[PDB]
Amino acid sequence: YRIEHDTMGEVRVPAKALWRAQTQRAVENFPISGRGLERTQIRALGLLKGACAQVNSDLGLLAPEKADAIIAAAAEIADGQHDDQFPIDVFQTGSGTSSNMNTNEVIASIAAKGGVTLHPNDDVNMSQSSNDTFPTATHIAATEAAVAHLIPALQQLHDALAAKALDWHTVVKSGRTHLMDAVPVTLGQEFSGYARQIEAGIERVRACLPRLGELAIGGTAVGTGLNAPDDFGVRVVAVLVAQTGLSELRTAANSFEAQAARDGLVEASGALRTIAVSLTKIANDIRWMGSGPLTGLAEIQLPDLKVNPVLPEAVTQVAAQVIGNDAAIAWGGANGAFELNVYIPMMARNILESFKLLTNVSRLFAQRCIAGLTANVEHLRRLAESSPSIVTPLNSAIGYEEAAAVAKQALKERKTIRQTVIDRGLIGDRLSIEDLDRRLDVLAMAKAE
Amino acid sequence: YRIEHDTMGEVRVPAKALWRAQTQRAVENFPISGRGLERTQIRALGLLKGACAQVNSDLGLLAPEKADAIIAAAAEIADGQHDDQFPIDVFQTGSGTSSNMNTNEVIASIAAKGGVTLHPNDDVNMSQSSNDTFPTATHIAATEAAVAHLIPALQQLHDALAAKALDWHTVVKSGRTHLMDAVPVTLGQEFSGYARQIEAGIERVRACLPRLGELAIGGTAVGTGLNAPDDFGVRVVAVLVAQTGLSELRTAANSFEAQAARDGLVEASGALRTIAVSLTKIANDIRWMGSGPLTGLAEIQLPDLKVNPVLPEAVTQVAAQVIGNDAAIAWGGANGAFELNVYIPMMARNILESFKLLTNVSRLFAQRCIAGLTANVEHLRRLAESSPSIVTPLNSAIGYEEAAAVAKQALKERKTIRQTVIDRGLIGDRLSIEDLDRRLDVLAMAKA
Amino acid sequence: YRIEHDTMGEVRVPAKALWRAQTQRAVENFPISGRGLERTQIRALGLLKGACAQVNSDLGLLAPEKADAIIAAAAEIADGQHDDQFPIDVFQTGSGTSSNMNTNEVIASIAAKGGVTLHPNDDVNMSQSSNDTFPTATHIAATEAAVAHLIPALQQLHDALAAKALDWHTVVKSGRTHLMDAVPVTLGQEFSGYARQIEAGIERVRACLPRLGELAIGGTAVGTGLNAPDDFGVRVVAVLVAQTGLSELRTAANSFEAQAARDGLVEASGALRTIAVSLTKIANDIRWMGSGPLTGLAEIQLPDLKVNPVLPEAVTQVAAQVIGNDAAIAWGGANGAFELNVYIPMMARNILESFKLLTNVSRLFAQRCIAGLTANVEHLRRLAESSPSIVTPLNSAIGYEEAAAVAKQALKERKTIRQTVIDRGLIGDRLSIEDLDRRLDVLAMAKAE
Amino acid sequence: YRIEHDTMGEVRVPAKALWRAQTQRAVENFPISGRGLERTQIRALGLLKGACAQVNSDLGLLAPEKADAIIAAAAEIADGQHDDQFPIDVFQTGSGTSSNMNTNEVIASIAAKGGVTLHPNDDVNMSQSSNDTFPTATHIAATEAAVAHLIPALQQLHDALAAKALDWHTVVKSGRTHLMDAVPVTLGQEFSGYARQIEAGIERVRACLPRLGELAIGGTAVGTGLNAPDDFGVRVVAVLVAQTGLSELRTAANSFEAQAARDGLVEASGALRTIAVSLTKIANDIRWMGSGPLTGLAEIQLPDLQPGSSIMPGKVNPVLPEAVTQVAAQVIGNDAAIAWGGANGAFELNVYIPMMARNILESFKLLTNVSRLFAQRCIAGLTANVEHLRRLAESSPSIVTPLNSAIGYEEAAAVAKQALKERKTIRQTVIDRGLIGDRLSIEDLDRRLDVLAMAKAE
């Protein structure tokens, strides 16, 4: 234990900890979840403190020797060497002040090892406030999770779904509407639908990026930029864009909206919620198609990990969590007051978790489920050919009444419509075998080649 | 009190009604909510039936006499002349087939009044299925609601907020963070923030239009187009765009996705929910600013309709409704199976209600609350003159070190920056009283 | 099109409208949804005004002739005679003061026609405020909906599920876990699970009644009872109980909690949301059981209204709406300030609609779906007797290696496990035909009563 | 590291790991959240495995030396000694079978260190299945969180709010409706409302326990009890109640409902969501009451807990109401996830258990922890600005009403007008208009304008 102090007085701190007194106060004040900032959030805070020290150096506001020590410690934090030094709960002051101070105190302690004296709030927090730094880090983490992780993961799932659409282009089967037998489709067509749902999901994430990428940096305490250079924002963003390659990061269109609200996180959660909705439909269909092996639909076989549909269950459970996280994000989003929205840590936890779950589960689903599905091709075609649904094209030749008798007999004898029409002696007067084969071609009915 | 014949018995229908037997069976099957389709949904079904008859006539599949009569009846339906011939509950067969058949039967009856006999299914439902029609009318209605009603209403609200941001550009007041006294801002700056939130809301709606506008029409029963002309979708969409002026209506990118899912309504509801979140923050700040006149902030006076903030209460209640509607839409969205999402009538009721509530309340908020707000300028300035100050704007007069000493002593002795500079005997050749006041001026601190 | 004079100016009021100037201004101020109060809310406002006039008369505060006029007018409103006289939008002032005034004006106008002059405020609103009346009417309406309408409807559905569970006691079929074939159950056992879900739903509704039936009446503007008799609450409640027979109605435990919050509505919506969850599971299984007639499960046939499962679709759509309404109620619930929660009309619309939809859809589901279901008995037994899941009790006789071979051949050749064991020549000293029959007794494996 | 053999080949496992092959496959199959079971779930799985081995011994199905070794290992898990041996993701197979096998394997590995061979499946999973175990452990954990932790934390907040209600019994202030000035109340009355909200919240938790405490144990794979003793459920329950003292644990009313659905978790989340709604109203009113101290309401002062700002050095923030409102938001989100998993079961099994368990147990923990912090570090230390509140109440136009019968509603309205315009008290404005006289004495006025009497405190 070692003694430290802040504006309010003196505080006991673990002796070998890189954090200081404000972080220690926050440890004692918020033992709520036992969970702190994620690696992506810590990395974001590191990048931002580095970019801030760079621009403060560039405007000759910060001595070069201090800027260099900050930039080196900030590199260390962005790299992941210091996660053990961020012990503050997610459920902290709603501005993220506490985690901002955590980053400043940890950076000061790293520089102190290299023999450089930094003041956490006069050097490491120079030209900044808690109010604009913690939301900036949150939007950097979210932008990076959308562009570098989620979109590529959904592109891999899209590609696995589109590959199946192609492989299964002629695998004709019974359509189902309302869960009841309908006119024919192909597994390919169904998988082209699933592929479109994920491609549309990528379009929805891309459409939110012009507002997700907005950074509050330079707005200071209330959005006015008081105590910061007038161009602090555009300079810090230019450093982050050059360092990350994330061209989507940009200065806020309005510095007050960017601090009074987190509407860009609510907007983004909407896209993730819509993806969760798409993945629920895709995973449900796939587990139903794999159902059996005797009493279910037995259309396809899932790869093993009689196989339980374990990846569909993970996907549907992840979707349920994204929906829950979405409601929490919208709740925090609505409840800002005046110059600041004080639900940032909670909203940050939820949107970053939704990004991570959808990313990881989309890759596992694509690789370990979609890629290895095998279709019961001949069985699917036999059912499609034996369905009362395909008798309609026969009504003009044999009449409604006889069409109905053919469907009833085909079902009762478990035979194809073709073999029932022959069995009933309808060939000859009503139509020829050539006519029957044209009318009952289930692949032509599916309007596939 | 006319009696009709159904293939499972007899059906008594009201004599003034234009619907027939299938619609009456649906009236009897689903007495759940006692609410039917809204005007918007009736209109879109009319628009769709007129367009389908036009293309069926153009392809020579439908005798022009019959097409003409369908087109005439459909135009009446689209023009709101029959909003009382659609008695089927919202909570019906999940394809919306019942409401589809309701539209077919009303058109048949209207045509019969002008001497033309139409079969509801073979003529009025020609080239269509029971599964591609109701989702098409739903996306027509939602696209029209977004483009012709919501976006203009939000633009009216944006423009009222932006007008106030300009009026109040130099109306200094105290900032509040965590509800606690903060450095100065202007009422103008806060309104510029509100205006940007509504502008971002319009951008959010605009961004969903490429998917909201996708129509299933031509996909038929399962998305394959069986029993429809190969170009039915593209030709119908072209007629609908021509008649409505809605360039946002488009053929589905994937005919299977367009019927297996309603992801477009889920996406759109997300934009409306975000708008509802923005509107809550704006309405809440405005009622708080008008709070009192004695026990509140008393920053502004709302127009009187001791004024209760009735329009902020209507806005926040609408917002709550849009959040609930949004949960219902997503729930229906997720629960499709194979070739058909069967939550369409419930998802339609919820998205179209969210569009209508946000449109109506945004116009009312803009016109009957925002436009008439008056600022208590002298009160606001007195709050600004009570905000914390910073020593930074003294740096050039006393130096980092003295300024640092001023901040420390102000904090320790719980004094203002201004009084601490005076008490330390800093007034003199280096800093006059005029200079200290100009350096710490509250409007300058707001950096307007 | 008759004319009324208002302080603000003249106001035109429709001819056969019983409302006055304040209601007309509200119609002009809030054109938002075009939907007004529901029949239950209007009846509750009538009930409350009658009981308030009865008590003001009993205490000597109101002339008997004025009290008699109010009680007669209020009875007509509570009888559903004036549902067209409440034109104000749900999205009105959040206390519901506009609707309270609407009731006062309608009563004054009904009394005017009988030669009695009532001041809407001074007489019909005597001892009441603008804030304790509308929530009192909401809680009366909700308590009545729960006790008189929803519980009976749920009891009807319970008894239909229980009746099917009894009729299907020995209808052995293949269990399903993860949608995959599992050891046997009966249709009866599954229906007994659905019955319990609905019985537990009735328990959930009964459990919230102690707080749902709490009435704010007598609290006046802020909960203190200023401007009302000290015993007004207990007196009006005693009249409402004696008149309606709703013993669940009670004074609020705390007069400030009853006006500052609508927590009892949020609690009740949670019970309705749980029922919506139970109904989703029941309706989804039932439509899945009736899927076919060829490519689906084909366990049961639903009665007509190849039959589409239209009532399970109505049920699952109602469940979605109840879930959405539940989210709106909680949102309004959380957002009260100080002495008053100003989301009452929105919360009232959503709770009373959830009660109505569940009541109506439960009765339709019980009568037109559940009562008429018919099981494919012989077919269910044949699949149960043909399932690889049931070979485990052969292990002690022929070994788990030979038992796996029997399972694989039964499935490939679409034969019963019994016929496959015989076909493979396993009958003999290690296994008698009677021993095989005991081992593969699928109904015994289900362990029904 | 150390090699093992599954029936799908060879698996590598951390050396100082007590889990075996199947847990390591699950670690490889499901890298989704990087978050595993919580301490309460692990303890519950320990309690259940020990109760099952006791009953299997009692019924003579499991050799006493095997049962004692499971009981000893299961007690180590329930005591929290092996909280690092459960690496499987929450986002696993929907039954919880992976986490069930994790428990069986860690128990087998603990017993091997003492010279006893346990087959994870045949001995540690005896009479149980892959489907009635995990939901049993979830309901144990959730019942224990409700009765042992949340209800006492709520009672502590209730008691802190009630003590303020009593201390502020006579602290008169203006009421606020629609955020506008209203007739007088006391700060004590408002706090009595907050107290009643938390008390009702405890009633709401109590009312769910008869169904939250229902255990699936003994139902086996599909709810029929096949491969288990007919009375396995009542016997395991009898042991769990005797050992834990948790009287709320009971065998399910219907064995199919208990595995096909998790409606008890949905029901309990509704109670927690209602508490989150109450806490939102209480915390929002409290931060507003403490707002300012110069530009806000300044009704009360919150105890200081850390510095708020560097730019504005002396600024102190309502950090505990902020933590409470954020926890509330998380409970509402978690509640939507639980209901979604709840509705989506199929036939004999609801396969959303691990996700529903994570969300309900977290809601219980956040509400417990934040309720105690709120009671101790915020409510207990609140101070009222008594003179400020009384001044506003004595100057309120709302209090002129009881002058009606003495001077007329018109003259009363002029007193309000004048007092409001000239920033004076109603009592002084009435004197300043020469109203004191024959029909209104100076003590009659003091009696009529008694603002505490107008609050009507019991």
Ligand SMILES: COc1ccc(S(=O)(=O)N2CCc3ccccc3C2)cc1NC(=O)Cc1n[nH]c(=O)c2ccccc12
């Ligand atoms: C999950 O659906 C199934 C699962 C397995 C099997 S199987 O290959 O193992 N199988 C077992 C039954 C059987 C009976 C006679 C001849 C051959 C067979 C072969 C069939 C089915 N469905 C059907 O038998 C469909 C069916 N057809 N025709 C009917 O009249 C009928 C009546 C009621 C329900 C369904 C139907």
Ligand SMILES: COc1ccc(S(=O)(=O)N2CCc3ccccc3C2)cc1NC(=O)Cc1n[nH]c(=O)c2ccccc12
């Ligand atoms: C919805 O599941 C079904 C629907 C209909 C029918 S039916 O009665 O109309 N029918 C069609 C198939 C058939 C084949 C030979 C002899 C008779 C029949 C009769 C069967 C089924 N299920 C099955 O055929 C189940 C099945 N059993 N054995 C297998 O190896 C297998 C392999 C792949 C997929 C499924 C399975």
Ligand SMILES: [Mg+2]
């Ligand atoms: Mg004040």
